[PDB]
């Protein structure tokens, strides 16, 4: 079936998490398709189903496990399986709909949520912005549990949204950005949870537009500047792929 990368929060270390993330990147882009030095995700179009998803199996010291499904085209979480049951974010269209049906085929219980997995929706449901939701090994530990128990009714909706926002940023966004990978490490190193500051959020929001500005740049020069924020919320602009070499690790396919 689809490839599985295993991770556990129990005795998680910086290397543990770093190895896991690199592992995940490796499984997303194996093609070495690269533009302006930044690897590019596979192109959605004419992608054989077999190559569309990858699974991330997560488990905690309490021995509760779930398996996320990530889309190799965007790196994003499309849903998860736990034990008997499996849940999916709302597909954006017919195509993405047919696709999910190849995930977790064996699962006895199949459900597709009415809502999508985009931040706007998830922050609405969580009752908090990403600014107010802490990240760390502990937060991730709880997120696993909260997904496991959902199948059984022991998880409230906001807690589920909240738990997704934690995984998306600790896995997908961390894959997409060495910078975000980094911020998570610091949190793990000290077993200290904290919500993401604007430098993080303005990145997460801008992945698409950065993926574009890059792939469409003139010899690396952005046709138009992409604006981001610093830790203190002060605005600054990015004119060149050069400054992002160390920042972003992946881009969705464009052109």
């Amino acid at each position: 079936q689809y490839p599985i990368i295993n991770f556990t929060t129990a005795g998680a270390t910086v290397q543990s998490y770093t190895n896991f993330i690199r592992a995940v990147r490796g499984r997303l882009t194996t093609g070495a398709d690269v533009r302006h030095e930044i690897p590019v995700l596979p192109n959605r179009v004419g992608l054989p189903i077999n190559q569309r998803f990858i699974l991330v199996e997560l488990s905690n010291h309490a021995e509760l496990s779930v398996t996320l499904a990530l889309d190799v085209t965007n790196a994003y979480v499309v849903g998860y399986r736990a034990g008997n049951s499996a849940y999916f974010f709302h597909p954006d269209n017919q195509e993405d709909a047919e696709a999910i049906t190849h995930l977790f085929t064996d699962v006895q219980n199949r459900y597709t949520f009415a809502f999508g997995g985009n931040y706007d929706r998830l922050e609405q449901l969580a009752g908090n912005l990403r600014e107010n939701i802490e990240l760390g090994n502990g937060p991730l530990e709880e997120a696993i549990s909260a997904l496991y128990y959902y199948s059984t009714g022991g998880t409230q909706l906001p807690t589920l949204a909240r738990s997704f926002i934690i995984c998306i940023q600790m896995i997908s966004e961390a894959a997409r950005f060495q910078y975000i990978e980094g911020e998570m490490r610091t949190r793990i190193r000290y077993n200290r949870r904290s919500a993401p500051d604007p430098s993080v959020i303005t990145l997460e929001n801008s992945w698409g537009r950065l993926s574009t500005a890059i792939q469409e740049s003139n010899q690396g020069a952005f046709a138009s500047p992409i604006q981001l924020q610093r830790r203190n919320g002060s605005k600054f602009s990015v004119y060149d792929v050069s400054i992002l070499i160390p920042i972003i690790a992946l881009m969705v396919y464009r052109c």
Partner: nanobody, 131 residues
Framework: SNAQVQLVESGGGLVQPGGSLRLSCVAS???????????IGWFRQAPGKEREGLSS?????????SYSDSVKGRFTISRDNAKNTVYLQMNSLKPEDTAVYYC?????????????????WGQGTQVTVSS
């Protein structure tokens, strides 16, 4: 029957306003997992009231804790692992706090004020603040 655990609360009673009580959640021997694997919450219920969440502690190894506005700077939830126990220390007690207090637990859980998010419950104990 993984995660099966019995919780016995105690430490409740009558106190003059401005007093202090220490409750206790003791997990009975022979649960497959010990209590440190658990989140424990603490709730109080008035006769008319439904269960209301007060203090909480996560299964998370960073010892993250939650406190409701009502009890902040007064209640402190803590752990003794070699005793397989979780204390809740109530200071500066006011008559408003009079109620039945419960401890609840969830294996690998998170700090929550929701009764639905815990699994195993204590038998409850009365707290009374008067003079």
């Amino acid at each position: 029957s993984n995660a099966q655990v019995q919780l016995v609360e105690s430490g409740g009673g009558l106190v003059q306003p401005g007093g202090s009580l220490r409750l206790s959640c003791v997990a009975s021997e022979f649960s497959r997992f010990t209590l440190d694997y658990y989140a424990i919450g603490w709730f109080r219920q008035a006769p008319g009231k439904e269960r209301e969440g007060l203090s909480s502690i996560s299964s998370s190894s960073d010892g993250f804790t939650s406190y409701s506005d009502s009890v902040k700077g007064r209640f402190t939830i803590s752990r003794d692992n070699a005793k397989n126990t979780v204390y809740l220390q109530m200071n500066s007690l006011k008559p408003e706090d009079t109620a039945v207090y419960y401890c609840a637990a969830r294996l690998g859980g998170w700090a929550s004020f929701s009764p639905q998010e815990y699994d195993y419950w204590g038998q409850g104990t009365q707290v009374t603040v008067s003079s």
